[PDB]
């Protein structure tokens, strides 16, 4: 199917408790492969997936050089943004950045991303054209002028259309046994009575990869969107994911209800019901 690579940067100031912390993590689809933490005893880029371990010394040292530079850079940027918003030096603040590339099922660039936030609020984004910016406010407008002066968008475009895609395709091949393997969900329906004449049907999906999945309950073939309790897809801790959907039904009417599962790893979309 489609694939993507993303890097996620988090820079956090902490007045009175040292210099701002910088963390970077890299992902291919729903698999993390690298980390960096400026708080680590010896800050360096560390592998987080087995298929990245084969990369030589020049890769790991180039990565570390970049993240070490970004640590210093984002500390300056935190200062800058505090200034743009007339904020005191007493508060803790966060810059987050998310960038990377999406490939279509054929393996060409679908689109690129380079997006930043301040205190969990969108700040500035590279537009889909990879040539222009969208600034959230008059503060971000200042960052935009800086980045237009330094021709940042041109340099992002070059990376996103070139190296990002090239490296993603390399990772997809090196880790093909995992990154290009879809694990279908193991599914079942549980039943828990709540009173004399109401009971809960819960539809389970377990051990699936990637995280993208659709669980829906139907009653008489009609979607139960407003009635379905739907938990957030959660990591099992072994690369795979878990999810459930629950509906409360009148006792005796359980056979009127059907759970539907859609996942990339399935030969066909599943229809489940409670088997007493």
């Amino acid at each position: 199917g489609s694939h993507s690579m993303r890097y996620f940067y988090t820079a956090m100031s902490r007045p009175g408790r040292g210099e701002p912390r910088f963390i970077a993590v890299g992902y291919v689809d729903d698999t993390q492969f690298v980390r960096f933490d400026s708080d680590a005893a010896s800050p360096r880029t560390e592998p987080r997936a087995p298929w990245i371990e084969q990369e030589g010394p020049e890769y790991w040292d180039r990565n570390t050089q970049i993240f070490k530079t970004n640590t210093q850079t984002y500390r300056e940027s935190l200062r800058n943004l505090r200034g743009y918003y007339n904020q005191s030096e007493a508060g803790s603040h966060i810059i987050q950045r998310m960038y990377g590339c999406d490939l279509g099922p054929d393996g060409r660039l679908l689109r690129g991303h380079d997006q930043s936030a301040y205190d969990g609020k969108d700040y500035i984004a590279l537009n889909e054209d990879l040539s222009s910016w969208t600034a959230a406010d008059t503060a971000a407008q200042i960052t935009q002028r800086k980045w237009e002066a330094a021709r940042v968008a041109e340099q992002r475009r070059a990376y996103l259309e070139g190296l990002c895609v090239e490296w993603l395709r390399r990772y997809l091949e090196n880790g093909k046994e995992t990154l290009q393997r879809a694990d279908p969900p193991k599914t079942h329906v549980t039943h828990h009575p709540v009173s004399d004449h109401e009971a809960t049907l819960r539809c389970w999906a377990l051990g699936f990869y990637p995280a993208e999945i659709t669980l829906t309950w139907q009653r008489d073939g009609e979607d139960q969107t407003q009635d379905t309790e739907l938990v957030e897809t959660r990591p099992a801790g072994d690369r795979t994911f878990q999810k459930w959907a629950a509906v409360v039904v009148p006792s005796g009417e359980e056979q009127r209800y059907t759970c539907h599962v859609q996942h990339e790893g399935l030969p066909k979309p599943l229809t489940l019901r409670w088997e007493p």
């Binding site: 990565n63 850079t73 943004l81 930043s116 960052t143 340099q155």
Partner: peptide
């Protein structure tokens, strides 16, 4: 592989 930044890149 991450994007390299030009010297003194700042917001």
């Amino acid at each position: 592989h991450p994007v390299g930044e030009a010297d003194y890149f700042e917001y």
